[PDB]
Design a binder for this molecule. Sequence first.
Ligand code: CLA
Ligand code: CLA
Ligand code: CLA
Ligand SMILES: CC(C)=CCC/C(C)=C/CC/C(C)=C/CC/C(C)=C/CC/C(C)=C/CC/C(C)=C/CC/C(C)=C/CC/C(C)=C/CC/C(C)=C/CC1=CC(=O)C(C)=C(C)C1=O
Ligand SMILES: CC(C)=CCC/C(C)=C/CC/C(C)=C\CC/C(C)=C/CC/C(C)=C/CC/C(C)=C/CC/C(C)=C/CC/C(C)=C/CC/C(C)=C/CC1=CC(=O)C(C)=C(C)C1=O
Ligand SMILES: CCCCCCCCCCCCCCCC(=O)OC[C@H](COP(=O)(O)OC[C@@H](O)CO)OC(=O)CCCCCCCCCCCCCCC
Ligand SMILES: CCCCCCCCCCCCCCCC(=O)OC[C@H](COP(=O)(O)OC[C@@H](O)CO)OC(=O)CCCCCCCCCCCCCCC
Ligand code: HEC
Ligand SMILES: CCCCCCCCCCCCO[C@@H]1O[C@H](CO)[C@@H](O[C@H]2O[C@H](CO)[C@@H](O)[C@H](O)[C@H]2O)[C@H](O)[C@H]1O
Ligand SMILES: CCCCCCCCCCCCO[C@@H]1O[C@H](CO)[C@@H](O[C@H]2O[C@H](CO)[C@@H](O)[C@H](O)[C@H]2O)[C@H](O)[C@H]1O
Ligand SMILES: CCCCCCCS[C@@H]1O[C@H](CO)[C@@H](O)[C@H](O)[C@H]1O
Ligand code: OEX
Ligand SMILES: [Ca+2]
Ligand SMILES: [Cl-]
Ligand SMILES: [Cl-]
Lengths: 202, 334, 97, 56, 137, 37, 244, 34, 33, 49, 97, 36, 30
Amino acid sequence: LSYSLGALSMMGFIATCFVWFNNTVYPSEFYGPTGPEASQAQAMTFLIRDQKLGANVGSAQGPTGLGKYLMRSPTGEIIFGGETMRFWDFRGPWLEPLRGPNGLDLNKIKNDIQPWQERRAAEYMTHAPLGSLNSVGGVATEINSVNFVSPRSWLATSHFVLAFFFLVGHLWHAGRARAAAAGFEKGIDRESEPVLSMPSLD
Amino acid sequence: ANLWERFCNWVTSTDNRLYVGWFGVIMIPTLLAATICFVIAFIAAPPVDIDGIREPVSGSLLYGNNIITGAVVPSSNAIGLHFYPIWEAASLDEWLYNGGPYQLIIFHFLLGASCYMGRQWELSYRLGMRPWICVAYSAPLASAFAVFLIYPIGQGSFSDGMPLGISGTFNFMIVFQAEHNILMHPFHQLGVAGVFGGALFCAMHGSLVTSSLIRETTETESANYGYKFGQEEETYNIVAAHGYFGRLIFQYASFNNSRSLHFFLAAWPVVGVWFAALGISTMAFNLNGFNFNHSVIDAKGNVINTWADIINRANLGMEVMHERNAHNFPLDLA
Amino acid sequence: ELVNVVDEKLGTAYGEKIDLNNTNIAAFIQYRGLYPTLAKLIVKNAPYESVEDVLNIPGLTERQKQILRENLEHFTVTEVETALVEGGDRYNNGLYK
Amino acid sequence: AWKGHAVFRNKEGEELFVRRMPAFFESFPVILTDKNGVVKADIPFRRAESKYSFEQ
Amino acid sequence: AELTPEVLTVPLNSEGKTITLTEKQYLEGKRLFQYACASCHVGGITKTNPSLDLRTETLALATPPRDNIEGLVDYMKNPTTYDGEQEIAEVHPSLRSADIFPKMRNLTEKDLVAIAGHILVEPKILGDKWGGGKVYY
Amino acid sequence: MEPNPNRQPVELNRTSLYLGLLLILVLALLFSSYFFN
Amino acid sequence: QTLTYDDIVGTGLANKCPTLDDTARGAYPIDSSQTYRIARLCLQPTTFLVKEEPKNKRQEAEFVPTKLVTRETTSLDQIQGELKVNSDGSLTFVEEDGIDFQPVTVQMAGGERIPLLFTVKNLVASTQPNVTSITTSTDFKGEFNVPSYRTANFLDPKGRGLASGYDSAIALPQAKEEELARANVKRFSLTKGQISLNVAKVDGRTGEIAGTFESEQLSDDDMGAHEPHEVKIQGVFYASIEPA
Amino acid sequence: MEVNQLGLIATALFVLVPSVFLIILYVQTESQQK
Amino acid sequence: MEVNQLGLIATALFVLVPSVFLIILYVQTESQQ
Amino acid sequence: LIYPLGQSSWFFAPSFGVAAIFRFLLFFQGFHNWTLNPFHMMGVAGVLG
Amino acid sequence: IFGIAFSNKRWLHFFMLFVPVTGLWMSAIGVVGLALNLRSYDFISQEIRAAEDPEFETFYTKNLLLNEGIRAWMAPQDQPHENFVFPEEVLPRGNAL
Amino acid sequence: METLKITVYIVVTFFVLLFVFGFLSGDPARNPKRKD
Amino acid sequence: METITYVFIFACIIALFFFAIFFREPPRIT
Ligand code: CLA
Ligand code: CLA
Ligand code: CLA
Ligand SMILES: CC(C)=CCC/C(C)=C/CC/C(C)=C/CC/C(C)=C/CC/C(C)=C/CC/C(C)=C/CC/C(C)=C/CC/C(C)=C/CC/C(C)=C/CC1=CC(=O)C(C)=C(C)C1=O
Ligand SMILES: CC(C)=CCC/C(C)=C/CC/C(C)=C\CC/C(C)=C/CC/C(C)=C/CC/C(C)=C/CC/C(C)=C/CC/C(C)=C/CC/C(C)=C/CC1=CC(=O)C(C)=C(C)C1=O
Ligand SMILES: CCCCCCCCCCCCCCCC(=O)OC[C@H](COP(=O)(O)OC[C@@H](O)CO)OC(=O)CCCCCCCCCCCCCCC
Ligand SMILES: CCCCCCCCCCCCCCCC(=O)OC[C@H](COP(=O)(O)OC[C@@H](O)CO)OC(=O)CCCCCCCCCCCCCCC
Ligand code: HEC
Ligand SMILES: CCCCCCCCCCCCO[C@@H]1O[C@H](CO)[C@@H](O[C@H]2O[C@H](CO)[C@@H](O)[C@H](O)[C@H]2O)[C@H](O)[C@H]1O
Ligand SMILES: CCCCCCCCCCCCO[C@@H]1O[C@H](CO)[C@@H](O[C@H]2O[C@H](CO)[C@@H](O)[C@H](O)[C@H]2O)[C@H](O)[C@H]1O
Ligand SMILES: CCCCCCCS[C@@H]1O[C@H](CO)[C@@H](O)[C@H](O)[C@H]1O
Ligand code: OEX
Ligand SMILES: [Ca+2]
Ligand SMILES: [Cl-]
Ligand SMILES: [Cl-]
């Protein structure tokens, strides 16, 4: 039993990461966008908006000196700027048409963004997996109005909790199985206390 | 015997002043590496661009910090969850600017502390003990995993792991409240019950045993000399202690079974801290504290504020000010 | 003497009207008919020596000119301020709600 | 030495009063009202939508 | 304070006609707005374009005017940019684009009137909170 | 393990305490001016 | 033989400009009646040099090597603009748009870090007269703009800024202001840089050229809080020239 | 006066360290079996 | 940094005075009997 | 008792409620920087210890 | 395991009284100070350095910015007797948020 | 860096092998009571 | 002087650990 508990704990941690990051066997059409996905979609949304207003999003310098919309990853790929720099490993079908060999392609951004991509980015940015335990959607300071917690959050949180307790159960039963096999799971024999037969530590 | 047998016998020896063991052969090098890097970085590391915006934060003593303000600063947001060992940097100067020490320290620490827990199982087995001290230790250990590994994974960056420093810890807590309303989360509330209760029951048990010590000493010596290491008789009168506490409240609210009592002392803080750890580890996936913002509304529809709405105003102040140069778009989505 | 140039500009007509050479594009929402079509053309074709030069933007339809004529009273022009126009800040100046 | 009592006025000549710091606050904004508590001037943080700057 | 017929009386058109919504219409409007619109317009702002809000004064300066029932109902059928110059059904939910915004598929003309009435009544209740964003929470 | 036979008790009688404290305090009274400089 | 994003991702190649074979020693004819543009200009820095700040004015300061600490995030690319044929046969490139800046931090011996906005923003660069064909003897020389490394919203660690932030040192409520004016009053720098492009290879058939560049510009001045350093950047470039 | 700022701790430790050495030795002499 | 100039001797005496108190008491315990 | 007695009024004492106490914590952070206080730090060590 | 261990049960249980009891007593002393606003709010040396050097940043200065946000954003509703009116433009905010 | 990487890989492999072979070396029997 | 002070106190604590562990008063069954 303890061996299987350790196995299931490991599987639970793996499933938690699968539903949090993977959008292939957990399609975002059904489960909502991943955390990385929605953050990338926000950057896409305001790139589209500001570029429609006339911004040259490739040369727009943000307050820090990094590009406001576009910057380089630590290995040079062109990626979305702002805090979503952390999410540049994200890949999704609404975004890949804009990607070329060196990352996000400025000419494709300038000329080839389709209305369905603007729609999908707006949809995912506004269904980011953030929300309260009573299912108020959005950041923690948001007002009541939207009844939403992403299925990705429900599935990730539940399976981390279960995986953790199953790790505890593994330690519990593994340690007990060892003690029972060796014959001291009920306590120390007063007439045969092992430490009393050992040399002092000092 | 052969050298491998003698080596195994020394590793697992119950006679070493500090037990080594097989968990120990991983624990000892990893904890030494993490300790040595931590001490050197805490004293002498240059500023670290934690948020990936070329705005380096000084953590070390030589670079303007004291004990309260100093920290080993988390690795850069530009790295995210990427693995950043020394050999991935072009130079130590680059490694330091991007927060390489933080990853080296927390990864060696988490591995070493996991082996510390396994080592507690291992020695209990070698000594013929029951095995579950290591299960009690899983509660602080799980909490360290929550703030150094699980929260970064859920948010996509080790730049959001807890900093290795006193003021950096407070920074993590305040930002956590702004983004998850952790105070309103029942797992953190169970955590508080766990540590308030643990401190309460610690003082209670200490005071009750101390109150019923059997007279073995004179007025001019410490009563502690009334107990001798390894004596067979109990050193206090548990029947007197229960007779006191059962009258303080009522008889059936008091433990007369020492095994039951000490099981309760173990279980209450351990379970409470498990829920604390699970609070951080599930807010890592943005299932946040209760949100009652504008929950109370009058007959016309005016918002009638509650204390939850006042909490919300404080959280907003934290939200709008934190990482004041890092956000370009209106929503903080991780 | 050291001067904050943005505070200084608030004491000019920039602090009273839409400055066609400097003001961020969201300000054109204040008046009917300017956003987003004219607002984009105005920012793209800036700077202007006088407010009336906005009527010379090539390609303006006759209705667009009428709308601009009705709103010249709400416009001003001042010297281009580097701090207000760099960083693409006329298109997105870091302010949302 | 006392510098004397400062009387603040806007361009229309109305007397304005600086909101005093309560003891609770290590720092405090600069906000000026008329005698009826209506805000008339301040020192802005964000400038881009400032309406009450001393310059204006 | 109460949700009176006066509060529930809002402009029907640009020519001075008003319409008085029932309490059931007001409740229906809140429900339908949350159902179809609040993911972007919670509290009267616009998350994907915060420069444009749902404040009555903002709607009044839209082209064509949107500060009345007829204007808002038309917007939900055939939305335009703020200057009326471009039709944006391809990127904004509407009856015209119910094929790509499926939550619009079951909205009836009666439902659109309720959503419009909600947008006009709510600032009469909440004041600056409506369209104010986090500053006014 | 067997104790070390080379150990010796140490003593400082009261007069030596007084002589030593006088030496230290007078040395401090002398050198302090040069420490402050 | 054409690489995909998944071929390139994480290798460092995304920060490198295209190269031309050693066989590319041709000549690209310019038709003075045709209009041209640069469809892609790429600048890959390989060395950052910083001029030391000497105590002796009689001493001529030198540019010294530095260590890059901000990783493979340094190249300018996807730059485009008009390539004008002037009446004297010289060509002038007028930069229009592109990824034409990178913040870069290099570190001097002893630890001093030098941030700069490596850039060719608003580049205008011209060849010698009578360039009937672009060859390995063609050179481009020009000027560009170097705006403030931080833009106007940037707030310092005490919350002070230019277009936002406090305008005083609020943690020292009764300090005298005069000594803090340089830190309290943020200023936005705008200076000029200079660049030379030395053509080393030409594919006459494709209109591609490559070579080396050297540019000089000022580093970050922290919104007026201290003096900038002089920086010299050297590297390789690539450009694709097309009939427009 | 512009004195050396380390003079205070220099004087304090100059007194304290050897004085404490002597006090330790004295008191443990008194406590020895008589 | 502009630290408080009494902080060094404050910290030094804070450590030394109670530490030597304890050392005095410990050593004279060892020397007994 | 002592804390509100030193302040302007009972208003700034803790109110008796769950969320009200949470507000008290956050007030002490923003106004008093109470996490930085070494007497609070010793309290934390005693409770967690 | 740990290098040290209890050996005296009487000391062990006294220590269990001493530790949490002493901790709560210390926290009470700090709150007595806060009754008078006698805070550990700042490190003066940090503030002097940061005021003169706009590149100097620690977690200590980062937390003060959070405190300043807390005060400005919660005070009008949390202290209604003061009748605070803080215009939008004076509220401290970082970029975008 | 490459030499550092190889060195650490060898060090880690060494200690991991000690861990695995150690626990394979009759660990259930290493207790004070019933060995089986 | 501040940094020296902080590191000195820390070094004393680590030395104290060493003595408290390896030069403890040995526990003896009475
Ligand atoms: C309260 C208890 C509880 C509940 C309600 C759930 C519920 C769920 N779990 Mg979780 N889990 C739990 C406890 C629980 N779990 C515990 C204690 C652990 C160990 C820690 C796990 C470990 C775990 C993992 C690792 C995963 C889940 C997953 C899931 C989801 C999918 C379940 C599934 O399909 O299984 C599988 C069902 C079977 C194995 C039964 C046989 C199914 C057959 C093979 C299907 C064949 C289908 C095929 C198409 C038929 C074609 C025939 C053809 C000829 C036509 C579901 C929401 C999955 C998930 O969504 O992750 C987020 C997932 O990956 N759970
Ligand atoms: C993997 C398990 C899993 C997950 C991810 C979900 C997820 C969801 N459920 Mg489902 N469900 C489950 C199992 C699960 N459920 C089980 C076991 C039942 C039978 C009770 C149901 C019956 C059910 C109903 C009837 C409904 C849902 C609904 C929902 C949705 C809203 C949930 C909510 O508001 O929670 C509220 C949160 C809580 C109640 C908190 C739970 C906290 C527990 C007590 C913590 C447990 C910790 C651990 C197990 C205890 C350890 C003890 C320790 C000493 C060892 C969400 C998608 C709702 C929905 O929208 O359906 C469309 C809905 O109406 N679920
Ligand atoms: C690591 C996290 C952590 C920990 C462990 C602590 C620990 C502590 N905090 Mg700190 N706190 C923290 C983080 C933390 N804090 C942070 C990040 C902040 C933001 C700055 C604060 C802000 C804060 C404030 C504002 C205060 C504390 C206080 C305390 C102390 C409270 C002791 C106590 O039990 O009072 C509980 C109350 C009592 C013990 C009083 C007696 C209670 C009686 C006996 C109850 C009888 C109940 C009765 C039977 C009826 C029950 C009915 C039922 C229905 C409810 C304790 C040292 C308090 C303090 O320092 O006090 C001096 C305090 O005022 N903290
Ligand atoms: C390079 C540099 C400078 C690095 C330094 C960087 C840095 C950040 C350093 C941190 C500085 C630091 C430590 C700050 C903390 C400061 C701080 C707040 C101190 C609190 C001081 C103080 C007086 C607080 C008052 C409250 C108080 C008394 C707290 C005491 C807490 C305490 C010591 C609790 C005990 C903890 C503990 C691990 C006990 C172990 C006990 C033990 C061996 C049990 C085992 C055991 C159990 C049994 O049941 C039985 C039967 C037996 C037999 C047995 O053995
Ligand atoms: C003026 C007038 C009218 C005057 C009238 C006066 C008068 C005559 C009054 C008569 C009384 C009366 C008629 C009515 C009373 C009115 C009334 C209901 C008042 C309510 C008072 C009230 C609300 C009290 C609440 C307090 C309360 C009951 C708290 C319970 C707390 C609690 C969780 C308790 C126990 C739970 C538990 C498991 C504790 C264990 C803790 C623990 C680990 C202890 C350690 C420990 C335990 C041992 O057990 C022993 C052995 C040892 C070794 C040991 O370590
Ligand atoms: C960097 C680390 C530094 C570590 C700290 C080192 C601590 C060093 C402490 C040294 C103090 C020694 C003092 C011993 C003092 C002491 O024990 O004296 C008494 C001692 C008598 O010794 P006996 O052989 O009688 O032994 C008796 C025993 O009990 C002594 O242990 O004589 C000497 O020690 C001889 C040399 C000192 C003679 C000094 C006399 C000075 C007269 C006063 C001068 C001042 C007035 C001048 C006026 C003009
Ligand atoms: C894998 C190896 C891991 C080794 C890690 C090193 C562990 C260090 C443990 C503490 C050693 C020092 C103990 C001195 C004190 C000492 O020697 O105590 C020894 C003492 C033994 O108690 P007894 O019951 O034997 O004593 C009874 C009578 O003698 C009392 O008069 O132990 C305790 O009292 C336990 C409670 C205090 C436990 C204090 C824990 C402190 C943890 C460290 C906190 C400070 C960190 C600061 C960081 C900058
Ligand atoms: C995000 C995905 C949205 C959803 C869902 C809805 N709206 Fe929207 N709205 C959105 C944007 C990006 C804009 C600006 C579009 C532009 O470029 O001009 C709007 C605008 C409006 C307006 C006009 C506001 C004004 O001040 O003139 C109205 C009246 C409006 N939206 C209403 C509305 C309704 C009723 C919705 C649900 C049925 C709805 N919107 C959904 C973004 C999004
Ligand atoms: C900051 C300044 C710090 C300065 C610190 C100076 C430290 C000085 C340490 C002095 C050590 C004295 O060393 C101490 O000697 C005495 C005798 O003298 C020994 O005592 C031994 O001899 C005496 C006398 O016969 C016996 O009664 C006793 O039973 C026996 O143990 C102690 O076991 C030892 O601990
Ligand atoms: C990650 C790479 C490792 C993969 C290894 C996969 C395991 C496949 C079989 C490996 C077997 C290892 O071989 C193992 O080591 C030595 C070799 O004689 C033996 O030696 C051991 O025997 C006895 C068992 O009572 C011990 O008390 C003794 O101290 C120890 O030397 C083990 O009994 C044997 O089981
Ligand atoms: C034994 C390890 C000692 C720790 C070494 C610290 C880095 S080395 C240190 O680096 C500084 C910044 O570049 C230099 O200014 C300084 O001259 C140099 O000694
Ligand atoms: O990094 Mn640290 O803190 Ca998590 O939210 Mn997003 O990111 Mn940043 O903001 Mn809020
Ligand atoms: Ca050449
Ligand atoms: Cl922050
Ligand atoms: Cl962002």
